[PDB]
Ligand binder design. Structure first.
Ligand SMILES: CC(C)S[C@@H]1O[C@H](CO)[C@H](O)[C@H](O)[C@H]1O
Ligand SMILES: [Mg+2]
Ligand SMILES: [Mg+2]
Ligand SMILES: [Mg+2]
Ligand code: NA
Ligand code: NA
Ligand code: NA
Ligand code: NA
Ligand code: NA
Lengths: 1011, 204
């Protein structure tokens, strides 16, 4: 029947979806959520064989093991085992678009397992098998007999094996197809893999059983009272002696209980549901659930007889909270939420798309430790354990249907076609049936990037009808259609409108007030974190805090989707699109996370943590005002530390207990601060510290910080003049300056400082020259490629203007002897095809102290694209171990991404001054620096800088970080000015005007000497 | 103004005067001005100015130079934004071009006297025999900032000898959202801490 090429057939003999079951035969076990003897895992070693198509699978495989098969671990993706290549493509489908057909060459994974079944499981009850996730479609056989079929790679498919099993040994045969008609609905931007990538298990249920149950919680106006309502459905023979008891527990204390026989209220002319019953429990002063305080109760559902004999028990964690939109605001327990969210794909560099508890926990802890309180399941239902962890650790979740048809033309071609309504509805309804009892899920999403079709309106209404406790959102078709309760645009900018036809992305501030609009606005995706990004992130949070209806958004995204490969020396390295021979591919576009695949943080993570702080600060005189952004908790695990320092030198510090009510304020009076002796700038740094460890953080965890410039004493005193006077030696080709053991050499033909000496030791490997370009960041490149150039991308504009090819033309190079110093004056013109791009005018003043004062004045043609930077660069012969600087740090920071950085004295090993982005580019910059120290060198002024073993050229010519080779010496880039990095999106220019170098004329000065 | 340095050096084809001043008030150093005057064979004086402003003093209203010229000419010719008075936060209507007006038009008769007549984005100014080139803001009249500051009505103003010239490298916005609380937006406040500007003075 080729069921994999028919959207009309999405399954065969699959059982109804339902909330997590364990079928405890002991109530205390259910209450405590301990393992159930009735729920077994079949994970472990299975037999596997790969075939090019379903037609190549031998029939004998149904009866017995194929000797050629291998023993492999399950769950797993077979691409991760090397049977075939994983494919990375963004929008364009990995198969020819010819619905509902798929390629005849359809990679087929043949899984099999010989397992044992206790006879007690077959002497009574129902034994079912559960496949939590099979990508993308499959047929199932048990002991040679066909059992069923199933689609949708992200939800569990369950089958009754009761009539196929025998006591003892049994053999499962599972034929998994890589491509199916379901693939047309799974075009998410991520690696395309396949196989049994989620848990497989066996569940035993009694013949008379609990077949489903829904838990709801209603509250009074002030949430001081609540009613828990549990609808319980059963299957099997109805008997008057049957009873259902629902008990609610708060720890080891039962707070409420209710029992009743089956038989619901009359619903229509034919009566009611004889196979259902609804229990209602009252709860006075319930402990409310929130991401701030994840209070949870335990609800135990017992199916038993009147005489008290337990048949079976099921249960779930319950979080008492109310989600509702009122007067244009999304409220949780009556308070307006501020979503500090992030999109998170289920990805592991080693295991591909197989998720495990440890990795999930590591993610949740890092998220919360970095002030996130929400996560979007981009773009499909997650591994069941994920919701349990969010319930317990406390994170707001957007559960999303596994539906994305991005590659269709137009995007809604399938979603507006009634023929596909059946397949789509099942991806939505079965998600709701599975996850509706999880408190962490506060919003339902209809899917992602599938345009806007009538099927969306139908399913939107279905959800509103079955579950009125959660809002429903969907971004497709313009982000504000009739299929969404929330305006949820992706990459809409703060102030700049992007009037695309039919689906514009208005400034989010403007979007809110369009004629007739009243819904809240929460970006489902924003701040694209591809490589060196997140520039302008602070602009978003300033708007979120100022506009009540701008309630936040979900950053895109959490972790780089890089995969591990091995070279000759067996060394592993991070790979991206195209690295597996997969073609066509979308190269590095699979890496947009705040953290690397191994969860190591990207510098941008700290910027997000800072802007997402829950405490705000203001300074007036000696008074610090601390305002809380928590909605429910008091600051009962917070301590404020303050420090005053003169140019990095501490002068005073202290700590004060924080005691602020949610959304409240606290005034802290700083004691009399001593008077600074030396000149310089005094800085105040405050930070909130959590004295006690929590479930997600260790003792001493820093959750927030802020800095302020206090008094500044300008230096007026002049240093004692030196008796020594530098000497100038003039020759036809050079201007040399000697000062004792030091020498400076200026090439009269090039006009640059070509060499420096301290004794007989050369200090340079490459001359000190101006630099106006940078190895292009992901945001500078956008979607441009060699085969498809995007003339609008920053990198293409710089290239076309000749910025990377420009040659320095010497206009002037003179030397003058002053009373106490030697003055070198130069002038260069950078041209490209008769066009003067930049003009650099400099003066080098070397005095008896051995200090070289460099003054630079640059002219930039107003009609050339604004340059990436205006500075100097050279390759030092020295390779030191430490880098010490007085400026913003300690992490990498750029003009439009430096709010998290603090001004102070920093000292790091040279390696930390380089950020290992998988795709190399300009990196490691540190701004607002007044002093830089490296080996025998010291640079003073007010500049930005990066320093490493990699020239901009190598970074610019290298595709992967593992191919980088430390060059001789150390490359230094000192910029008077540097362009922002941008990031509002990574496919169009995103650097805001205030961060572009458009002034036309620039001035900066540096003093180079020895430390 | 407190003199910190003043030296003269003879170069190959020019004389170089280096100066440095500190403006203080009750022990506090508000501003520091470092300049260099380079006078070459062509008779042109290139003035380089680098100023430091203490981060904790209220941002200054302007950062430039001023002087009373002996010359009193009929016209003022300049290549910059004009022809009417325009300030940093009120210059969108002005146009860049060559403007030529009688001196009196370079003064705005506000009933309540105050800073007035400025013209921004000027690359060249011509008055009498003098020519100033660079990228500055300027106002030029027969009234010193001091007289305007001490006079309550425009009819009480009196032309002073010669002409007062104020050439700024930078000038603060004028504001206006309201007139009873600070209304100059942050982007128009002189808060950079360090400023640089260059002027070339010569005989037209
Ligand atoms: C390639 C763009 C035109 S579409 C853009 O690509 C991004 C890549 O990370 C994300 O997948 C966004 O969700 C998607 O809209
Ligand atoms: Mg099908
Ligand atoms: Mg997509
Ligand atoms: Mg700050
Ligand atoms: Na808001
Ligand atoms: Na991506
Ligand atoms: Na506290
Ligand atoms: Na590169
Ligand atoms: Na006055």
């Amino acid at each position: 029947r080729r069921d994999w090429e028919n959207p009309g057939v999405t399954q065969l003999n699959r059982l109804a979806a339902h909330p997590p079951f364990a079928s405890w035969r002991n109530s205390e076990e259910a209450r405590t959520d301990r393992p159930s003897q009735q729920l077994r895992s079949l994970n472990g070693e299975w037999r596997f064989a790969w075939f090019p198509a379903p037609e190549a699978v031998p029939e004998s495989w149904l009866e017995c093991d194929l000797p050629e098969a291998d023993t492999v671990v399950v769950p797993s993706n077979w691409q991760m085992h090397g049977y075939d290549a994983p494919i990375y493509t963004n929008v364009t489908y990995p198969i020819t678009v010819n619905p509902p057909f798929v390629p005849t060459e359809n990679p087929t994974g043949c899984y099999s397992l010989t397992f044992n079944v206790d006879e007690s499981w077959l002497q009574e009850g129902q034994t079912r098998i559960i496949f939590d996730g099979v990508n993308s479609a499959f047929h199932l056989w048990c002991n040679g007999r066909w059992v069923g079929y199933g689609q949708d790679s992200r939800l569990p498919s369950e089958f009754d094996l009761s009539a196929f099993l025998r006591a003892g040994e049994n053999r499962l045969a599972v034929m998994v197809l890589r491509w199916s008609d379901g693939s047309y609905l799974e075009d998410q931007d991520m690696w395309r893999m396949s196989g049994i990538f989620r848990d497989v298990s066996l569940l035993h249920k009694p013949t008379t059983q609990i077949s489903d149950f829904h838990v709801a919680t209603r509250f009074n106006d002030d949430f001081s009272r609540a009613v828990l309502e549990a609808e319980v459905q059963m299957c099997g023979e109805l008997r008057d002696y049957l009873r259902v008891t629902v008990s609610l527990w708060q720890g080891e204390t039962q707070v409420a209980s209710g029992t009743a026989p089956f038989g619901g209220e009359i619903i229509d002319e034919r009566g009611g549901y004889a196979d259902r019953v609804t229990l209602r429990l009252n709860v006075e002063n319930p402990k409310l659930w929130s991401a701030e305080i994840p209070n949870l109760y335990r609800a135990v559902v017992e199916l038993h007889t009147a005489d008290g004999t337990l048949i079976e028990a099921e249960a779930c964690d319950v979080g008492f909270r109310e989600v509702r939109i009122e007067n244009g605001l999304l409220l949780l327990n009556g308070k307006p939420l501020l979503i500090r969210g992030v999109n998170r794909h289920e990805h592991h560099p080693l295991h591909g798309q197989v998720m495990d508890e440890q990795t999930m926990v590591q993610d949740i802890l890092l998220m919360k430790q970095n002030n996130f309180n929400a996560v979007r399941c981009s773009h499909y239902p997650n591994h069941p354990l994920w919701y349990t962890l969010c319930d317990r650790y406390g994170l707001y979740v957007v559960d999303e249907a596994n539906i994305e048809t991005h590659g269709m033309v137009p995007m809604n071609r399938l979603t507006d076609d009634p023929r596909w309504l059946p397949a789509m509805s099942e991806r939505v309804t079965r998600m709701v049936q599975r996850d509706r009892n999880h408190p962490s899920v506060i919003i339902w999403s209809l899917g992602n990037e599938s345009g806007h079709g009538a099927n969306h309106d139908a399913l939107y209404r279905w959800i509103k009808s079955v579950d009125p406790s959660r809002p429903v959102q969907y971004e497709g078709g313009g982000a504000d259609t009739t299929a969404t309760d929330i305006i949820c645009p992706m990459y809409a900018r703060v102030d700049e409108d992007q009037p695309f036809p039919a689906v514009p992305k208005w400034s989010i501030k403007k979007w809110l007030s369009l004629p007739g609009e009243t819904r809240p606005l929460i970006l489902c995706e924003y701040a694209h974190a591809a490589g060196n990004s997140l520039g302008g992130f602070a602009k978003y949070w300033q708007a979120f805090r100022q506009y009540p209806r701008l309630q936040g958004g979900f950053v895109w995204d959490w972790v780089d989707q890089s995969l591990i490969k091995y070279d000759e020396n067996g060394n592993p390295w991070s790979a991206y699109g195209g690295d597996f021979g997969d073609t066509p591919n979308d190269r590095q576009f699979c890496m947009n996370g705040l953290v690397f695949a191994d969860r190591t943080p990207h510098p941008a993570l700290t910027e997000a943590k800072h802007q997402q702080q829950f405490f705000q600060f203001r300074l007036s005189g000696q008074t610090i005002e601390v305002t809380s952004e928590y909605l429910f908790r008091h600051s009962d695990n917070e301590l404020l530390h303050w420090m005053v320092a003169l140019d990095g030198k501490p002068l005073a510090s202290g700590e004060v207990p924080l005691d602020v009510a949610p959304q409240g304020k606290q005034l802290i009076e700083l004691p009399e601060l001593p008077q600074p002796e030396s000149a310089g700038q005094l800085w105040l740094t405050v930070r909130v510290v959590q004295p006690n460890a929590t479930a997600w953080s260790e003792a001493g965890h820093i959750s927030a910080w802020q800095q302020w410039r206090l008094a500044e004493n300008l230096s007026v005193t002049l240093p004692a003049a030196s008796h020594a006077i530098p000497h100038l030696t003039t020759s036809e080709m050079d201007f040399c300056i000697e000062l004792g053991n030091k020498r400076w050499q200026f090439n009269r033909q090039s006009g640059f400082l070509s060499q420096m000496w301290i004794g007989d030791k050369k200090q340079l490997l490459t001359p000190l020259r101006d630099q106006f370009t940078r190895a292009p960041l992901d945001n500078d490149i956008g979607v441009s490629e060699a085969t498809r150039i995007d003339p609008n991308a920053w990198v293409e504009r710089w290239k076309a203007a000749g910025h990377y090819q420009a040659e320095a033309a010497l206009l002037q190079c003179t030397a003058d002897t002053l009373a106490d110093a030697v003055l070198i004056t130069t002038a260069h013109a950078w041209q490209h095809q008769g066009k003067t791009l930049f003009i650099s005018r400099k003066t080098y003043r070397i005095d008896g102290s051995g200090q070289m004062a460099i003054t630079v004045d640059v002219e930039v043609a107003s009609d050339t694209p604004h340059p990436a930077r205006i500075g100097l660069n050279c390759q030092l012969a020295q390779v030191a171990e430490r880098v010490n600087w007085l400026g913003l740090g300690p992490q990498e920071n750029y003009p439009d991404r430096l709010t998290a950085a603090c001004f102070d004295r920093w000292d790091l090993p040279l390696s930390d001054m380089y950020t290992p982005y998988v795709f190399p580019s300009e990196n490691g910059l540190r701004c607002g620096t007044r002093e830089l120290n490296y080996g025998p060198h010291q640079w003073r002024g007010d500049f930005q800088f990066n320093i490493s073993r990699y020239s901009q050229q190598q970074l610019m010519e290298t595709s992967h970080r593992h191919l980088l080779h430390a060059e001789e010496g150390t490359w230094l880039n000192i910029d008077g000015f540097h362009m922002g990095i941008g990031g509002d999106d990574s496919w169009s220019p995103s650097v805001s005007a205030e961060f572009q170098l458009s002034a036309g004329r620039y001035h900066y000065q540096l003093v180079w000497c020895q430390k």
